[PDB]
């Protein structure tokens, strides 16, 4: 979850060791389309997206990609506009990688407001990856180009929560929306 | 018989607001009382007959 409005976070990575030895899930969201590929990406110590600013983006998050056996382009994925809190729930069970999304405007201080906001299903595709580690991809936008070397110019705000198997009692409104939830544990 | 769900009912075309990913609706007894038309985007309830 994050409340940014400058399109900083626009992708994530998923994998076991984040190298070419095992498979890795690369999900990147552009301004007009989304690219989701399963390949032996050689992730560096600090993966980030480069920009030559407006267009002509360079994928400097990986070093090599050979197998590349699964690709998926939806281009409806996750931006939900630019005018605040976009919550996402990632699940990997039985080989299928489920993704959820929801757009909720923020009208309070820099903190998680009260209430309930149910997330809507986004996409469900099988990747067959033993996902154990992940890292959030963010656009640097240092007003210039940058090489593939790590520890770039970070000088020029997201929440992370872990899920657990819990029992819930969902309450649906008269219109069919979820307005309350109870964590039995 | 929309998507293989056979039975007996009467369509009423209610004003239920279904979501794009939701197509079937069940009651307390898990009986499908509302379905989405495959061709048109209208909402049709399945109510039992007399």
């Amino acid at each position: 979850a994050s409340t940014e409005k400058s399109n900083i976070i626009r992708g994530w990575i998923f994998g076991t060791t984040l190298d070419s030895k095992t498979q890795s899930l690369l999900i990147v969201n552009n301004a007009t389309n989304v690219v989701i590929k399963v390949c032996e990406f050689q992730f560096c110590n600090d993966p980030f997206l480069d920009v030559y600013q407006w267009m002509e983006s360079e994928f400097r998050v990986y070093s090599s990609a050979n197998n590349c056996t699964f690709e998926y382009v939806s281009q409806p994925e996750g931006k939900e506009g630019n005018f605040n809190l976009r919550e996402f729930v990632f699940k990997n069970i039985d080989g299928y990688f489920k993704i959820y999304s929801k757009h909720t405007p923020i009208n309070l201080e820099r903190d998680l407001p009260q209430g309930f906001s149910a997330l809507e299903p986004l996409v469900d595709l099988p990747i067959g990856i033993n996902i154990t580690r992940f890292q959030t991809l963010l656009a640097l936008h240092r007003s210039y180009l940058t090489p593939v070397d790590s520890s770039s110019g970070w000088t020029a705000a997201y929440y992370v929560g872990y899920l657990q198997p819990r029992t819930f009692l969902l309450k649906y409104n008269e219109n069919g929306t979820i307005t309350d939830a109870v964590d039995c544990a | 018989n929309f998507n293989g769900l056979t039975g007996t009912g009467v369509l009423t075309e209610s004003n239920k607001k279904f979501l794009p990913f939701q197509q079937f609706g069940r009651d307390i007894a898990d009986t499908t009382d509302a379905v989405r038309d495959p061709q048109t985007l209208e909402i049709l309830d399945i109510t039992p007959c007399s």
Binding site: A1, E87, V89, Y100, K102, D111, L112, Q114, G115, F116, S117, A118, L119, E120, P121, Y159, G161, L163, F168, L170, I178, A181 | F21, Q22, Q23, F24, G25, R26
Partner: peptide
Amino acid sequence: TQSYTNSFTRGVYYPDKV
């Protein structure tokens, strides 16, 4: 760099498509 917060009543999604 890292902070610790708590989610009060957020994190729920639709389990099925019914």
